[PDB]
Amino acid sequence: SMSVKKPKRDDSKDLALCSMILTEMETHEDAWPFLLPVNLKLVPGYKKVIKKPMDFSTIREKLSSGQYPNLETFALDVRLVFDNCETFNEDDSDIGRAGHNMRKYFEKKWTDTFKV
């Protein structure tokens, strides 16, 4: 509260770390469904069904232009990518499995990098 400051973690390297994690996402072999926005005029259903589309290149743009206030908002966009993927694609499919793989890959890096 007012004049009662909680000790807070050193956040000064968050930008460089999130960038590093994102680079590793982008270079993963199963990253191909998520590198670019889904084509709204070539993929039937997507615009109507998925209310907040997100992909790595959009994340990369927001990261490069100061549009994430904190590392938690960045992780929200990354998870949004895989949450959209689950919504639209069957777990069995190539894209669906890519999504589960990439989420697992992200969440470990997130823990390793930031949670102590």
Curated annotation (Swiss-Prot):
Compartment(s): Nucleus
Domain Bromo positions: 9-113
Top-level taxon of the source organism: Eukaryota
Distribution of this protein across tissues and organs: Expressed at varying levels in several tissues, whereas a smaller transcript was expressed specifically in testis.
Subunit: Component of the BRF-1 ISWI chromatin remodeling complex, at least composed of SMARCA1 and BAZ2B, which regulates the spacing of histone octamers on the DNA template to facilitate access to DNA. Within the BRF-1 ISWI chromatin remodeling complex interacts with SMARCA1; the interaction is direct. Component of the BRF-5 ISWI chromatin remodeling complex, at least composed of SMARCA5/SNF2H and BAZ2B, which regulates the spacing of histone octamers on the DNA template to facilitate access to DNA.
Family: Belongs to the WAL family.
Record function comment: Regulatory subunit of the ATP-dependent BRF-1 and BRF-5 ISWI chromatin remodeling complexes, which form ordered nucleosome arrays on chromatin and facilitate access to DNA during DNA-templated processes such as DNA replication, transcription, and repair. Both complexes regulate the spacing of nucleosomes along the chromatin and have the ability to slide mononucleosomes to the center of a DNA template. The BRF-1 ISWI chromatin remodeling complex has a lower ATP hydrolysis rate than the BRF-5 ISWI chromatin remodeling complex.
Name this protein carries in UniProt: Bromodomain adjacent to zinc finger domain protein 2B
UniProt gene name: BAZ2B
